């Protein structure tokens, strides 16, 4: 049967970038041509593989990561990028093989009173390793005094809200991102394009 790409792209809501969802796709036939021409995409960049060649290739597993960021941060979802999102929220490896797809979701993720449900990790001591997901809410220690789970001076909550409003500039508007990873182990492949 067909691979469930529609469950990821057409999901009625998306996760925050710090708690990005991952869908493991296996043992199915994938129709990439219909998927990539379904909706209109503002960002479509592939790395290490052509999007027309996927219909001919087979992989052990295909990963479909999805999350929401703002417009000025879509450029960070790429191999070799740095920034608050790429370092503390979602990191792709330098030899990432796959495609990153994004589209404007101002109609879906922005509120009149502001949508503060989408968060991103603002404070973290070290950078995330490739494909790392940190959902910790421990109080960040910015000084020499321990915080002991209490917010205060040099003691910050590590998550920060976006606050999406439909009248903001396109750089501040919410964008839903889908990152397709194509893993090729030395094991029998289960996902072939067709």
């Amino acid at each position: 049967n067909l691979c469930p790409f529609g469950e990821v792209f057409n999901a009625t809501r998306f996760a925050s970038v710090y708690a990005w969802n991952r869908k493991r796709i296996s043992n199915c036939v994938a129709d990439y041509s219909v998927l990539y021409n379904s909706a209109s995409f503002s960002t479509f960049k592939c790395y290490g593989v052509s999007p027309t060649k996927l219909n001919d290739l087979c992989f052990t597993n295909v990963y479909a990561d999805s999350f929401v960021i703002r417009g000025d941060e879509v450029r960070q979802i790429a191999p070799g990028q740095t920034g608050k999102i790429a370092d503390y929220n979602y990191k792709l490896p330098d030899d990432f093989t796959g495609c990153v797809i994004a589209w404007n979701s101002n109609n879906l993720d922005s509120k009149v009173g502001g949508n503060y449900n989408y968060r991103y990790r603002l404070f973290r001591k070290s950078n995330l390793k490739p494909f790392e997901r940190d959902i910790s809410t421990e109080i960040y220690q910015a000084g020499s005094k321990p915080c002991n789970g209490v917010e205060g001076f040099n003691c910050y909550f590590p998550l920060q809200s976006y606050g999406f409003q439909p009248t903001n500039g396109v750089g501040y508007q919410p964008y839903r991102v889908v990152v397709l990873s194509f893993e090729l182990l030395h094991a029998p492949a289960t996902v072939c394009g067709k």
Partner: antibody
Amino acid sequence: EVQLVESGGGVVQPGRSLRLSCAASAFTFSSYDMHWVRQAPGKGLEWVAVISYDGSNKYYADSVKGRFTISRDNSKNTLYLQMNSLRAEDTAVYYCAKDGGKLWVYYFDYWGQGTLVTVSS
Amino acid sequence: DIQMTQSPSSLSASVGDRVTITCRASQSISSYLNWYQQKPGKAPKLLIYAASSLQSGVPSRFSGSGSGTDFTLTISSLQPEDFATYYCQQSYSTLALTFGGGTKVEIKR
């Protein structure tokens, strides 16, 4: 023995439109992806767009996205590039390039002689 | 985009000399790096693809090497018809293909 012949270049005013062609020969044209690569006067090479073997998937560089349109007619073995809203930055020699196809990634193995597009009033 | 920086921008060598051109990448591109030769007023021609694979019909005096961010093209014995401009082009970012600045090999007198 792989041949590519372009045509349709010339002069064009800013904001107007122009269409280029690329007649292929001596290879299976309906099975390889095709590219467009331009080269400004005295400058380097810049990849423009790519189209699949069947013409169902099209991808463009950001410098021409929402402004150019790539297409192909497999029955005529010709590649097309509809260039609309031409700016002075588009003044360049336009090549069409056949995809190598021996890798998972794109690369050009054969190039056309190229045709000039001069955008000026 | 991924910037490709070639060094030197111009070099002068005689027939028979061994010429080595360097191409650096702003980020790791694994082995997806190609080399092209362009004669003035002529279409580019592929020399090396996938960093080290020689294209069919290209003389064996051309050879490529390197991986990651640093790459090298080598002409073991320069010939009179080899005087041209040589470009490197990364293919790791398949939908954002970018060329190097180019290295024009000239005749030393």
